[PDB]
Design a binder for this molecule. Structure first.
Ligand SMILES: O=[N+]([O-])c1ccc(OP(=O)(O)O)cc1
Ligand SMILES: O=[N+]([O-])c1ccc(OP(=O)(O)O)cc1
Ligand SMILES: O=[N+]([O-])c1ccc(OP(=O)(O)O)cc1
Lengths: 387, 390, 80, 390
């Protein structure tokens, strides 16, 4: 049966998500797709054609792919120290949970940024020795602050471990976007447009809305604590519109970030996902060589007993490569997958995957912050089970 | 023939514009042997240090409330092993948070002993890098001095600890929890218990959580830029003699203000009475406040530290272990300033400091008011006194 | 099959379906008892990593209490 | 000037309906310095505590049988290193079981020293979570008091140990094994040996495994809900003053009942005679029961514990190590109630407790009958006496 529809319709019928779209492609063509629910529960408008989503950290694989392109082109390399491009990142310090501060004993590199092993953290990180100082500095909160200036403020704060030595999901993709700007003399949104979006015909993807985008923007729900005091337990899963403050503007021509901030559509994100199966456009234009794509996808960070975790939530059987998660042990996985399946997700519950063993890609688009229901993994499992 | 190094230290500090006013006294065999004063009550006015000047002693409150706990143990109200949840069920089912966002139930009950040793897993609002201090600040545990002790404890009780009770050491709000548990166990207020069991018998008439009737004109001005409850600083505040803003954390005339870990006003003379008593457990007249057996139980080294040593916000207390009342010198060859084996006492945020040295039958106290001092005046005065007493 | 059908998932805490399994404790061979520090999941049950034992388990810190409770012995008792 | 905290403790316990009747005595320099009684013989009848009241002292039997072992060592019957299998071949070829169902041969012989230190690997029927206690209960080792010591030991000998002899510590039935090995080595009965070598010389006329002829009317009633040999409890039995059913585990008039780890009846006065003797190894008249060298051998700390400390059924004995006769205080800074370095003694299941404190030439004993007390009356009485003796 159509497990994907059953999952999505159950979520809508239980008042857990307002609206959901999905598509799964094989060999670059749709084999499953659908939608459930509405754009917004307040007026129950149907999900529009080419509906627009805040994809949050699904921005990261895109910005990471751009960095790989610049590496291939010789702009910098995995081992390049970031201080070479912005000296504000010379002389970093490292703080610990016992209030001890000392100089970093290793320089932060491009590779560290792409692997979240640089020692940065995130404003919303619970129990973190530095997240209070991120919150005070409004790093995530102040969406109106130019990328360049936000980085100056971040650069003055201590890391939470010595670069290279541990893993922690972090604001490092934003650092990467900034370093890209320093290295190229170009803005990251312009680079993304020219090198990735245009070639893949992703006309609806950017850090601001298309001129006709307002009526297509999905409403966002949920109570997650994104820049306030980190919650000691998850907020109740209730469909109430989320307040994004000034963290995520719709029409700021200078808003650009590395770790979040893109608006996209299901169709646009599917084009990016399909490309990751080969490094080419559908017409056959190369965006990244097979060699460098293999370098980007190979498992690079391996995890101990407790596995990969973010705010203590597990990613069972996953390792980290230069673009996001990668399945390295089906016997440890918590939901259907195959060896080498890779991808990432976003705070508003958007999720995608690429499964090279099946030449398969999939994406679930929805808008819920702080979900207590792992819709992304439920939809991947459903799709896997339908092959 | 040794010169007066005590006066020299105090004088230099005042002449260097580092502290406004400083008073000190060192007693031996219960009688003053060195004493002095330097500077003024306040720098704005240069009013002279009044007779019986009054100081906010902050954590020098801790040895007093700890001593009261020991008296109650001696009297059978509770024991070191008593789980605090027996007296306040709000402390049943504690959780423990870590630096990786992981929360789990505590695997051990918090006891009276844990509170007196700072091994309960509590923290403090100003603790830099702490997995929970952000939640303390949001709750305004320290900032909101007007909140009753009992109500503040209800808010604290809902927060997780930062390690499992008994398994580590971290200087903390646990003495406030102890003051509260004392009230739960006895059905009395901690300020009344302190008044009747300690202050009255020792004639400490100027000591309490609010100013005496004639106290306002005797209150020393407090200086410095330490932030007691704001975002913890990444480096020490500059040492500048500017008056400190205490907000509403340390009221002068709130008849219900009472705490375990700070909040007392006292005077040099009153505190010396307490310190001298600690040499024997008796009042000068010979009333026993605490038997020699239980005083020995309280002073014996109880928490021992591992290479890193005892630290608070990463500042070292070199060669010190912890007993039920505060610090205790356990290795002179690791000490960072003059002392003798067994020397004990504590200090307060505004740079007040005292010690008791049983090998010399000596006590010492320096009183001053500076929050966030970059100069360890307490240890400098102790070292000076040690150097002067053979 | 029920996982494939979406009834629950490997990571589902069992207490979500029967709250009698909230607040489990853990015993050891030295008589020490403490609260469990992790919730039991469907995956734990399928892998025998939940911490349960068996009435007939020799040397087990809890099998005596299973035997006293007749868990295996009392076949007539309803599963629930 | 210190008030009578001993009477206060006892009184409160009786007035709170927590214990039926309590007697205590503290001696210094071999003469009574504090003493008293509180409550009644039995709550049903409220009969007053009789003269020379008799108590089941349970594991306060252990220091007595241990002391007899030391006398026999001094006399050359055996040595600390003697393998017990030399005296009873039933203890040849022991096995060791673990919590994972694995059984293997013991890699070391059990010695006299192992039995006196509870390091032989034996356990006890009531031990919660134990790899072997289920088999002890099936065998009715404790329950069947009517079974001769010699026969019970044959049944025990067939069971595996829970660790290899010498490698760990667990409070156990090993003192019963010792009593038995004493009988094997000497060809005499342990009760006769105790009578001749210890009770007679110390004039302990009311002490033995059966009641004196006029004993029944003097026997204190025993209360409480602890289950001595049933399925071990997952949490403490409620503390309720209801008479306890001892079944046939503790007969009053069985001329062959004798054990190493429990079973003696005694009186406060008789036990104080034993305790006082332990200060010197001599009778009041000056007969040597045990030379100073061997008494020192017996009292020196012999088993040292690792962070977790000494525990029995997970209850702590904080700051205590173990010597050949029972507990010994080795760190006052880890102690959970007042004491001095070197204080030693033991206690019994029905809440009887005694201590000897060589630094004060002091002994103390509290007698009461409550099985499974949730209130540590023994330690409370010790703390009270310590507080009263400077
Ligand atoms: O900017 N943000 O609010 C923000 C940025 C990144 C986040 O992380 P994610 O949940 O992995 O997308 C979550 C929130
Ligand atoms: O409440 N307070 O502001 C506060 C309490 C305790 C303190 O700790 P101290 O520096 O050891 O006195 C410091 C400040
Ligand atoms: O035989 N018994 O019933 C028995 C034997 C030993 C006991 O151990 P205790 O509590 O240390 O006296 C308790 C009970």
């Amino acid at each position: 049966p159509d497990l994907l529809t059953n999952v999505a319709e159950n979520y809508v019928n239980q008042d857990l998500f307002a609206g959901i779209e999905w598509r799964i492609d094989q060999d670059g063509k749709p084999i499953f797709q659908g939608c459930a629910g509405v754009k917004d529960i307040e007026t129950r408008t149907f999900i529009p054609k080419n509906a627009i989503y805040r994809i949050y950290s699904m921005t990261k694989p895109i910005v990471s792919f751009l960095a790989m392109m610049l590496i291939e082109r010789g702009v910098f390399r995995l081992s390049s120290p970031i201080q070479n491009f912005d000296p504000r990142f010379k002389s970093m310090k490292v703080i610990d949970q016992h209030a001890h501060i000392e100089p970093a004993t290793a320089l932060i590199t491009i590779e560290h940024l792409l692997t979240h092993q640089a020692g940065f953290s995130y404003d919303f990180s619970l129990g973190c020795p530095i997240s209070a100082h991120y919150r005070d500095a409004q790093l995530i909160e102040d969406g109106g602050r130019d990328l360049t200036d936000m980085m100056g403020v971040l650069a003055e704060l201590p890391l939470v471990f010595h670069p290279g030595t541990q893993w922690k999901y972090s604001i490092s993709t934003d650092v990467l976007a900034h370093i890209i700007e320093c290295a190229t003399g170009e803005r990251v949104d312009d680079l993304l447009q020219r090198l990735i979006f245009d070639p893949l015909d992703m006309q609806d993807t950017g850090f601001s809305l298309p001129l006709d985008g307002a009526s297509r923007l999905m409403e966002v729900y949920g109570m997650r604590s994104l820049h306030g005091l980190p919650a000691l337990k998850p907020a109740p899963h209730v469909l109430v519109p989320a307040d994004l403050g000034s963290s995520h503007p719709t029409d700021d021509p200078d808003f650009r970030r590395g770790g979040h901030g893109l608006y996209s559509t299901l169709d646009d994100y599917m084009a990016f996902a399909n490309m990751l199966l080969s490094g080419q456009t559908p017409e056959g234009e190369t965006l990244l060589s097979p060699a460098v794509l293999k370098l980007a996808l190979a498992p690079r960070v391996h995890f101990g007993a407790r596995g990969m975790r973010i705010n203590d939530e597990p990613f069972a059987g996953y390792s980290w490569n230069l673009l996001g998660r990668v399945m390295t042990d089906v016997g440890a996985a918590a939901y259907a997958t195959h060896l080498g399946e890779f991808g990432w997700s976003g705070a508003a519950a958007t999720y995608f995957w690429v499964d090279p063993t099946k030449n398969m890609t999939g994406c679930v688009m929805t808008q819920f912050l702080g979900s207590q229901h792992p819709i992304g993994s439920d939809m991947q499992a459903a799709a896997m089970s339908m092959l």
